[PDB]
């Protein structure tokens, strides 16, 4: 029943602070200790610290003493983590997760996790991405397969969400990890579909970049 929602600025400038939030639904927040965990890219989970909404009693990891402050409001059912003196090493995904002794044993230890929220510390500015279709250089064969794609070039910061046909195509899809080069990210997404579906139905990629409030849909057309 319970869900936790992490939210916060996607881009922050070195030396500033950032304030993350954890919105709990499906139950009161007074039943949970709320713990924050971060994961730098291609690294493992690091426990940041926790706060007890009951009394605001907090605990911190060694390495986040004097970086981190936990705060809460019960009536808003949301927990806060403030992180100060930011450097590039703070660029990471932040999750929140729970401990509880008010239910079963199986529900005590980090049973629930937020979806996670990426935070980039950087001096660069929010750059909207450019979307370009990858369409077959050679024409259609009736009864076969076909692979289409979208280049999403030159955006900052992470992340971007790609879909195909607003969710209707989920199989046959590969969205590759973005690559930074010269301050900008570039990713491709592909989808493999029947030769019939391409001529009969429209095939479109929907790319979102919430950091720049960009929304782009692009139909892939033969060339």
């Amino acid at each position: 029943e319970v869900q936790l929602q992490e939210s916060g600025a996607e881009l922050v400038r070195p030396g500033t602070s950032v304030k993350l939030s954890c919105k709990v639904s499906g139950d009161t927040i007074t039943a949970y200790y709320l713990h924050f965990v971060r994961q730098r890219p291609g690294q493992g989970l690091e426990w940041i610290g926790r706060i007890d909404p009951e009394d605001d009693s907090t605990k911190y990891a060694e390495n986040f003493k004097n970086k981190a402050t936990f705060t809460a409001d019960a009536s808003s059912n949301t927990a806060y983590l403030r992180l100060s003196s930011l450097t590039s090493e703070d660029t990471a995904t932040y999750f929140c997760t729970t401990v509880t002794f008010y239910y079963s044993r199986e529900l005590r230890w980090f049973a629930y996790w937020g979806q996670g929220t990426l935070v980039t510390v950087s001096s660069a500015e929010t750059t909207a991405p450019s979307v370009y279709p990858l369409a077959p250089g050679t024409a259609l064969k009736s009864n076969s397969m076909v692979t289409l794609g979208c280049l999403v070039k030159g955006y900052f910061p992470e992340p971007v969400t790609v879909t195909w046909n607003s969710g209707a195509l989920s199989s046959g899809v590969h969205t590759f990890p973005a690559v930074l080069q010269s301050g900008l990210y570039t990713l491709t997404s592909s989808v493999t579909v029947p030769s019939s579906t391409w001529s009969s139905q429209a095939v479109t990629c929907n790319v979102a970049h919430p950091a720049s409030s960009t929304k782009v849909d692009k139909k892939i057309v033969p060339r």
């Binding site: 713990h35 965990v37 994961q39 493992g44 989970l45 690091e46 426990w47 610290g49 605990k59 911190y60 990891a61 060694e62 995904t93 999750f95 997760t97 401990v99 002794f101 008010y102 239910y103 079963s104 044993r105 199986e106 005590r108 230890w109 980090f110 049973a111 996790w113 937020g114 979806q115 996670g116 450019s130 370009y132 279709p133 990858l134 369409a135 077959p136 250089g137 692979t147 794609g149 280049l151 070039k153 590969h174 969205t175 590759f176 990890p177 973005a178 690559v179 080069q181 570039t186 990713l187 491709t188 592909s190 493999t192 060339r223």
Partner: protein, 323 residues
Amino acid sequence: QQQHLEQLLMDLQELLSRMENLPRMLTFKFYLPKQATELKDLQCLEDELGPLRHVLDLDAENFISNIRVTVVKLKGSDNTFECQFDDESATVVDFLRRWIAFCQSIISSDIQVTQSPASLSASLEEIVTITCQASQDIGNYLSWYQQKLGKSPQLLIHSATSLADGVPSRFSGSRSGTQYSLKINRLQVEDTGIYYCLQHYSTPYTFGAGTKLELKRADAAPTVSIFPPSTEQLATGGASVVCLMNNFYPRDISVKWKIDGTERRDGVLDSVTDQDSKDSTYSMSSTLSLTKADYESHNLYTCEVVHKTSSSPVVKSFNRNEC
């Protein structure tokens, strides 16, 4: 021996006596074994000292800590009895009364954790073991978690040995003193992913460094596709040629871009997907970024791919001059 028991009894009598004298600490849910008849059953008491600590409000740490050392002295240290808890919960009071009764009945530094291996590839139906080693006696206060595609971790095994609700029955947890083992009884396709242990015995909590598990598969040749710059992009003054290699195994592969017969290495970006959770293959994207000016100065663009599935390199090309 029986000086240890009576000391425990009085410590538990002390706890019960000074617990009763608001209805806020009565919400915490403790759990008891079905049967508690031997000294080695005191493992089940040790397992509940975590919550027992939290309820103890208003440096009582010393009290629980010294109870624990007494229990460790009493339960046996030779072997690791797994406790079997009843589903029915108890207040802090009834729990205390129960263990007190059991005692009367029977009288007649930050914690480091090392995970290993760091990475592993294994076949379908294989039995896999992952280990965590704790720097200290942490008892049953370690749990195992899974994570895929950098998404939300998911609890697999809690309290060293208990399966979480929701988790496949093939996952199981074992403990021998300070050695903890996550075992996957006959690996499935969807098991590709990262596994982490977490000590949650005392603050600060600590995760293991993680284990990257990949599935072995039979070989699979890539589907190779090359794409010229879109007219839309050329208009913008850029020219990205893209090569997609899809659903290949193993992951080890090499791609060269040639322009009119000559290798270009600058302006190339490579990206590889994580192992597919349904087919255990990999896919790869190679993009060669040129200026429109540069792109329009040459004719033949080739993506040349080396993979073990072919004795000669797989080649995909286009001539700009046609399109």
